[PDB]
Amino acid sequence: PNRLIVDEAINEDNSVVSLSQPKMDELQLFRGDTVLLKGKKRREAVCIVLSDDTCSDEKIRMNRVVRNNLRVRLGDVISIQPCPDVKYGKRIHVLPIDDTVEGITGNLFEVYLKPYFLEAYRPIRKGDIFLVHGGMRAVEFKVVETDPSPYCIVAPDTVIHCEGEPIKREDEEESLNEVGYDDIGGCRKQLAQIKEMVELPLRHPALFKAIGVKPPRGILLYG
Amino acid sequence: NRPNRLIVDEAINEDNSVVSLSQPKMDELQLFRGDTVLLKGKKRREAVCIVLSDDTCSDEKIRMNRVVRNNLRVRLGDVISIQPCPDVKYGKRIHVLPIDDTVEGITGNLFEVYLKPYFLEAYRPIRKGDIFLVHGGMRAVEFKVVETDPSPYCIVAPDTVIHCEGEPIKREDEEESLNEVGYDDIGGCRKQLAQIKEMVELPLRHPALFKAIGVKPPRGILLYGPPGTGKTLIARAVANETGAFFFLINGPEIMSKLAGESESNLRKAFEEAEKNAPAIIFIDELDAIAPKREKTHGEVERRIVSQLLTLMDGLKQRAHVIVMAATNRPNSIDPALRRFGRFDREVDIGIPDATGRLEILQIHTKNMKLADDVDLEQVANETHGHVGADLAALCSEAALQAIRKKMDLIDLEDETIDAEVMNSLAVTMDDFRWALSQS
Amino acid sequence: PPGTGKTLIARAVANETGAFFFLINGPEIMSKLAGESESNLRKAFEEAEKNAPAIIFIDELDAIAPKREKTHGEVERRIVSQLLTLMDGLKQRAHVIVMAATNRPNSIDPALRRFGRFDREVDIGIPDATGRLEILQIHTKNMKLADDVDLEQVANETHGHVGADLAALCSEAALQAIRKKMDLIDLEDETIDAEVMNSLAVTMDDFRWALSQSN
Ligand SMILES: Nc1ncnc2c1ncn2[C@@H]1O[C@H](COP(=O)(O)OP(=O)(O)O)[C@@H](O)[C@H]1O
Ligand SMILES: Nc1ncnc2c1ncn2[C@@H]1O[C@H](COP(=O)(O)OP(=O)(O)O)[C@@H](O)[C@H]1O
């Protein structure tokens, strides 16, 4: 009813998720409304929602950044619900993750945080991990706490502390500047084919006990 | 011996409960179209069937399904006695149970999925101890008839109560699985199949005969054709279909072994088929082992070719072993193999034509629920240059497409795909027309 | 060409002239490992020397002694030589004739055609119509043929056939006629008396069928 299949993002923004127009009408959501998304393993994340008229009705486009905080891969299921109850924060606390900051010195507020948030009005959740590009390297930041806990918006008013020591990566947490379909271009057509070939046997593998059909076993790549 | 015994032939009417007969032989036996008959075969076994007039059937032969053949414990070309059975009245109780090794993976109600549609307006004769086969939900399921109320045999009318009570049953030694490959599992090449069958007929079915006569049976059979044409398939089938033992020699797998242990294997293959006679040894991708004597660079590759040729000669005609082998062309092979006494028999398993392709398609869509708009005839016409395995994968893809479409809608739980949910899953002509853009 | 009775002739001549017959099969010799391959080849000549007079028959010669460049690697050449030595080492007083067969001259190492070795070449060609008839007769001499069987006709139809083609043709035509009767012999088995056997005629139809099979 309100549950959706998680698809690839076309709007490469961390805080936004797209949805088909009629599915927004169905769920009674307005363009720019903020939504709470729940995924696997007790996890949720907060996002802005926009109408994408190329999106499938029962699917929801979202960034890898988001997917991660939800602990879901592409083609999974997530519940979406409205969240207009969300308010500007006083006091966000972010820390960089040590393995994305070896080599860079000093003030990383001015370089990443600041331009990532100028007129941001970004929804965020405690325990969120987001990614900022710049200075020829991408940096991951975890939100260690927020003043309206558990989730707040970040307005010009909101004070933002990145207090010294970078934090260790959790086992659960996956490097975001690891390798994804968003790291490869010029070959959507070919990529699509690979994805569907591998979709079921890798994502829904228990299925092949239930049916006598044969999944492709070997895939050859020309070029 | 008598005017009622017959030779068991291949079924053209692919229905479990019917057997066909030549019109004059029905007149001779005074049987009527639709009359139900009792068939007695080997090892104390009998089965009950409807009978229909087939005007392409031989007068002294009787067409029947593999399903039936099994319950009669007979292979093709054997003898069975047929007699009228108008005494069979409808049943009340029937107890069927699925055989464990055809139901691993499927859940819950298998009545609604298989039994029910198999019996809707069936009026099917059946016997206690019969094992029949139902197609659906992308897997075939074998069910044994554990008892009937009019014992030993009854007909199953709408009135008849049908019970499949829980626990699936173990398979007996005598009972042979039906997924096992048969000639009904291969299409588009009757002509070539016929030849194979008669070549192998006597030496595998009546092997003691060759002590009595000084005639030489073919020892080696070579299978020409592009790859994926069912060359392997045919050999697998013929072995099962004629109750012969089947030893596979895979060309590349033999070259994978180090020098000398490569031959020690090859030799051990012939020693295994000798041991379990009669047998078909099937050498797949022959040219991997025995290519033209100049195409073999280095000694050990030639030492192998020879080692084979020695085993082929060393093959006594009294061994009762037929060696079948397959390759993509004649010219690939060392012409030494085509000598009298070795691979003296060459069969050309070609490229299925339109009509053949249709069959192939039908053989691979026999377990899946197809939509009304599915036009397999159309598909056949579109797939102009396709070999059998092309089409088998086409059906595999079209189905996996239809599963992906539903796999989104089955978000609600997993791994929750019941056998019932499975049969809910139809495959649209669209899913085929899509799968065509791939192959 | 192969199947022309090259082996057959050698077998015959040995028996027909009371000579001992040792068969050397080309491929079978290459099947053996290195050095034990020669130890066999040498032991063949030692066996024919021992039982004189004899014909040693080397079948599929080219399997052993192909053109000196067609032999890749040493042990294949070491074999060719080992033969040539035995061919020379063959005393004329030994009373042993070595016969050998192959599909063509060019396949063979021309070293073998030297004076004192394979100095004599005979060309067992392809049977012509009249020949094919004989072959057919030779392989139908134990089977009961039907009146309508016209082996002359068969010969004419089988234009490009070698002897072994025709020997198998007869074998098939007979196995066809057996299959036809094998249905009617349902009554018992293995009950095929020698008498039931002679009841079994082979119709011209069984031949015309067997023609649709062969090469
Ligand atoms: N004529 C045919 N009829 C039915 N199935 C076929 C046919 N040809 C190929 N197939 C299917 O495609 C595959 C062919 O594999 P294989 O038997 O190895 O063919 P080949 O030996 O010609 O390569 C088999 O899995 C079989 O199910
Ligand atoms: N000219 C012939 N006359 C009679 N039989 C023949 C003739 N040619 C071939 N055959 C038969 O066919 C087979 C030929 O085998 P083989 O003697 O090895 O011929 P080759 O050595 O020419 O290959 C034999 O079994 C023989 O019975």
Short mmCIF file of C-alpha atoms in Angstrom, two decimals, chain C:
data_model
loop_
_atom_site.label_atom_id
_atom_site.label_comp_id
_atom_site.label_asym_id
_atom_site.label_seq_id
_atom_site.Cartn_x
_atom_site.Cartn_y
_atom_site.Cartn_z
CA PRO C 1 41.29 -45.74 -49.78
CA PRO C 2 40.38 -47.34 -46.49
CA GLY C 3 38.13 -50.39 -46.37
CA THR C 4 39.38 -51.79 -49.70
CA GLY C 5 40.51 -55.12 -48.24
CA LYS C 6 44.18 -54.16 -47.91
CA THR C 7 44.20 -55.91 -44.51
CA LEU C 8 41.96 -58.65 -45.94
CA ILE C 9 44.35 -59.45 -48.75
CA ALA C 10 47.35 -59.73 -46.43
CA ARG C 11 45.35 -61.94 -44.04
CA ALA C 12 44.38 -64.09 -47.05
CA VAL C 13 47.81 -64.42 -48.67
CA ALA C 14 49.35 -65.52 -45.37
CA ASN C 15 46.75 -68.29 -44.89
CA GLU C 16 46.64 -69.14 -48.57
CA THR C 17 50.44 -69.68 -48.68
CA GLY C 18 50.60 -71.32 -45.21
CA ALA C 19 52.67 -68.41 -43.88
CA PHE C 20 52.58 -67.10 -40.31
CA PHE C 21 50.80 -63.78 -39.91
CA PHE C 22 51.84 -61.04 -37.51
CA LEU C 23 49.68 -57.92 -37.44
CA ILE C 24 51.14 -54.57 -36.56
CA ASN C 25 48.41 -52.04 -36.00
CA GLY C 26 49.71 -48.49 -36.49
CA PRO C 27 47.62 -46.68 -33.92
CA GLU C 28 47.94 -49.50 -31.36
CA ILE C 29 51.72 -49.03 -31.48
CA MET C 30 51.45 -45.27 -30.92
CA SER C 31 49.08 -45.99 -27.99
CA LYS C 32 52.01 -47.44 -26.05
CA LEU C 33 54.31 -45.09 -24.16
CA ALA C 34 57.71 -44.03 -25.60
CA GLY C 35 60.33 -46.79 -25.95
CA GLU C 36 57.90 -49.54 -25.00
CA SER C 37 56.35 -48.53 -28.35
CA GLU C 38 59.61 -49.60 -30.09
CA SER C 39 60.13 -52.62 -27.78
CA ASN C 40 56.83 -53.87 -29.22
CA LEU C 41 57.65 -53.02 -32.84
CA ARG C 42 61.01 -54.78 -32.52
CA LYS C 43 59.34 -57.76 -30.82
CA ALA C 44 57.04 -58.10 -33.84
CA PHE C 45 59.93 -58.63 -36.22
CA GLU C 46 61.48 -61.05 -33.68
CA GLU C 47 58.22 -63.06 -33.72
CA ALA C 48 58.04 -63.34 -37.53
CA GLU C 49 61.75 -64.23 -37.75
CA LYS C 50 61.08 -66.94 -35.19
CA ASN C 51 58.14 -68.41 -37.13
CA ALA C 52 59.30 -68.37 -40.71
CA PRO C 53 58.17 -67.96 -43.32
CA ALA C 54 55.90 -65.10 -42.33
CA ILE C 55 54.02 -62.04 -43.42
CA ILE C 56 54.26 -59.05 -41.13
CA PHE C 57 51.37 -56.74 -41.90
CA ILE C 58 51.60 -53.10 -40.86
CA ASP C 59 48.15 -51.57 -40.90
CA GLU C 60 47.67 -47.83 -41.09
CA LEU C 61 51.38 -47.33 -41.68
CA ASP C 62 51.14 -43.53 -41.82
CA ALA C 63 50.21 -43.65 -38.14
CA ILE C 64 53.80 -44.73 -37.51
CA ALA C 65 55.88 -43.32 -40.39
CA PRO C 66 54.42 -40.14 -41.82
CA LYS C 67 56.49 -37.63 -43.78
CA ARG C 68 59.62 -36.71 -41.78
CA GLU C 69 58.30 -33.11 -41.28
CA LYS C 70 54.72 -34.20 -40.34
CA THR C 71 56.33 -35.82 -37.25
CA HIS C 72 56.36 -33.15 -34.53
CA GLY C 73 58.69 -34.01 -31.62
CA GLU C 74 61.50 -36.55 -31.33
CA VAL C 75 59.98 -39.82 -30.19
CA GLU C 76 57.78 -39.90 -33.30
CA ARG C 77 60.93 -39.72 -35.48
CA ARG C 78 62.75 -42.21 -33.25
CA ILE C 79 59.94 -44.64 -34.06
CA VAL C 80 60.09 -44.12 -37.87
CA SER C 81 63.81 -44.79 -37.71
CA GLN C 82 63.38 -47.86 -35.47
CA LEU C 83 61.17 -49.33 -38.20
CA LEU C 84 63.54 -48.50 -41.07
CA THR C 85 66.35 -50.22 -39.12
CA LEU C 86 64.22 -53.36 -38.72
CA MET C 87 63.35 -53.21 -42.43
CA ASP C 88 67.06 -53.07 -43.30
CA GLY C 89 67.96 -55.43 -40.45
CA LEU C 90 65.62 -57.78 -42.28
CA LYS C 91 67.93 -60.44 -43.74
CA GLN C 92 66.77 -61.68 -47.17
CA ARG C 93 67.44 -65.18 -45.72
CA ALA C 94 64.89 -64.50 -42.95
CA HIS C 95 62.04 -65.62 -45.29
CA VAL C 96 59.82 -62.81 -44.01
CA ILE C 97 57.81 -60.48 -46.24
CA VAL C 98 56.63 -57.23 -44.71
CA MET C 99 53.35 -55.97 -46.11
CA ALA C 100 51.99 -52.61 -45.17
CA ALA C 101 49.04 -50.49 -46.07
CA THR C 102 48.17 -46.83 -46.17
CA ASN C 103 45.67 -44.40 -47.71
CA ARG C 104 48.17 -42.76 -50.05
CA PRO C 105 51.88 -42.57 -51.01
CA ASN C 106 52.37 -38.96 -49.85
CA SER C 107 51.35 -39.72 -46.27
CA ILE C 108 54.34 -42.05 -45.94
CA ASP C 109 57.95 -41.07 -45.26
CA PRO C 110 59.61 -41.56 -48.68
CA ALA C 111 62.52 -43.14 -46.77
CA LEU C 112 60.46 -46.33 -46.67
CA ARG C 113 60.30 -46.65 -50.48
CA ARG C 114 64.08 -47.14 -50.74
CA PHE C 115 65.56 -50.20 -52.45
CA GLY C 116 65.61 -53.03 -49.87
CA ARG C 117 62.58 -51.80 -47.90
CA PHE C 118 59.14 -51.08 -49.46
CA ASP C 119 60.41 -51.40 -53.01
CA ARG C 120 57.08 -52.92 -54.18
CA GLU C 121 53.87 -50.86 -54.45
CA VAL C 122 50.45 -52.27 -55.33
CA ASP C 123 47.37 -50.17 -55.99
CA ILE C 124 44.25 -51.78 -54.52
CA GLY C 125 41.79 -49.33 -56.08
CA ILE C 126 38.03 -48.85 -55.95
CA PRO C 127 35.92 -51.80 -57.11
CA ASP C 128 34.12 -51.16 -60.38
CA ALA C 129 30.56 -52.37 -61.02
CA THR C 130 31.65 -55.93 -61.85
CA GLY C 131 33.91 -56.06 -58.81
CA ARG C 132 31.19 -54.68 -56.48
CA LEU C 133 28.96 -57.52 -57.61
CA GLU C 134 31.54 -60.10 -56.47
CA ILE C 135 32.00 -58.33 -53.13
CA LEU C 136 28.23 -58.45 -52.65
CA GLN C 137 28.16 -62.13 -53.53
CA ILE C 138 30.95 -62.82 -51.04
CA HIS C 139 28.94 -61.25 -48.24
CA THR C 140 25.59 -62.80 -49.16
CA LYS C 141 26.94 -66.32 -49.37
CA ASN C 142 25.65 -67.32 -45.96
CA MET C 143 22.28 -65.59 -46.06
CA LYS C 144 19.13 -66.79 -47.77
CA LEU C 145 18.23 -64.21 -50.43
CA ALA C 146 14.75 -63.78 -51.85
CA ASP C 147 14.03 -64.40 -55.55
CA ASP C 148 13.54 -60.68 -56.25
CA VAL C 149 17.04 -59.86 -54.87
CA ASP C 150 19.05 -58.47 -57.81
CA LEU C 151 22.64 -58.09 -56.53
CA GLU C 152 23.64 -56.92 -60.02
CA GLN C 153 21.19 -54.06 -59.65
CA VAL C 154 22.62 -53.27 -56.21
CA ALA C 155 26.13 -53.19 -57.62
CA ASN C 156 25.09 -50.66 -60.27
CA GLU C 157 23.41 -48.41 -57.73
CA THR C 158 26.39 -48.42 -55.34
CA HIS C 159 28.60 -46.39 -57.64
CA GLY C 160 31.26 -45.01 -55.35
CA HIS C 161 31.55 -47.76 -52.83
CA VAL C 162 34.56 -49.52 -51.36
CA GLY C 163 34.45 -53.18 -50.30
CA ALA C 164 33.74 -52.51 -46.62
CA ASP C 165 30.82 -50.24 -47.62
CA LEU C 166 29.26 -53.21 -49.33
CA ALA C 167 30.04 -55.61 -46.50
CA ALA C 168 28.17 -53.35 -44.11
CA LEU C 169 25.36 -52.87 -46.65
CA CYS C 170 24.78 -56.60 -46.58
CA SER C 171 25.05 -56.60 -42.81
CA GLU C 172 22.38 -53.93 -42.55
CA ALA C 173 20.01 -55.44 -45.13
CA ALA C 174 20.15 -58.64 -43.07
CA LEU C 175 19.69 -56.94 -39.73
CA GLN C 176 16.69 -55.16 -41.30
CA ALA C 177 15.16 -58.49 -42.34
CA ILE C 178 15.79 -59.78 -38.82
CA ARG C 179 14.03 -56.80 -37.23
CA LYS C 180 10.96 -57.37 -39.43
CA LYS C 181 10.78 -61.00 -38.26
CA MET C 182 11.86 -60.15 -34.69
CA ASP C 183 8.40 -58.62 -34.10
CA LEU C 184 6.65 -61.82 -35.32
CA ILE C 185 9.00 -63.92 -33.14
CA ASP C 186 7.24 -62.65 -30.01
CA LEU C 187 6.14 -66.16 -29.05
CA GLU C 188 9.32 -67.08 -27.15
CA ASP C 189 13.05 -66.32 -26.75
CA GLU C 190 15.91 -66.99 -26.92
CA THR C 191 14.11 -69.51 -29.09
CA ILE C 192 15.65 -68.78 -32.50
CA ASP C 193 16.48 -72.26 -33.83
CA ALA C 194 18.89 -72.75 -36.66
CA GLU C 195 15.73 -73.79 -38.56
CA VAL C 196 13.93 -70.51 -37.73
CA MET C 197 17.15 -68.91 -38.95
CA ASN C 198 16.95 -70.49 -42.40
CA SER C 199 13.27 -69.53 -42.58
CA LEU C 200 14.67 -66.00 -42.66
CA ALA C 201 15.01 -64.70 -46.21
CA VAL C 202 16.31 -61.25 -47.07
CA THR C 203 14.15 -59.34 -49.56
CA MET C 204 15.40 -56.93 -52.23
CA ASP C 205 13.38 -54.40 -50.23
CA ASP C 206 15.70 -54.92 -47.23
CA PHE C 207 18.60 -54.06 -49.51
CA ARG C 208 16.94 -51.01 -51.10
CA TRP C 209 16.34 -49.84 -47.56
CA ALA C 210 19.92 -50.41 -46.46
CA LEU C 211 21.04 -48.28 -49.43
CA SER C 212 19.34 -45.22 -47.91
CA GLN C 213 21.74 -45.57 -44.95
CA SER C 214 25.33 -45.99 -46.25
CA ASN C 215 28.07 -43.75 -47.73
#
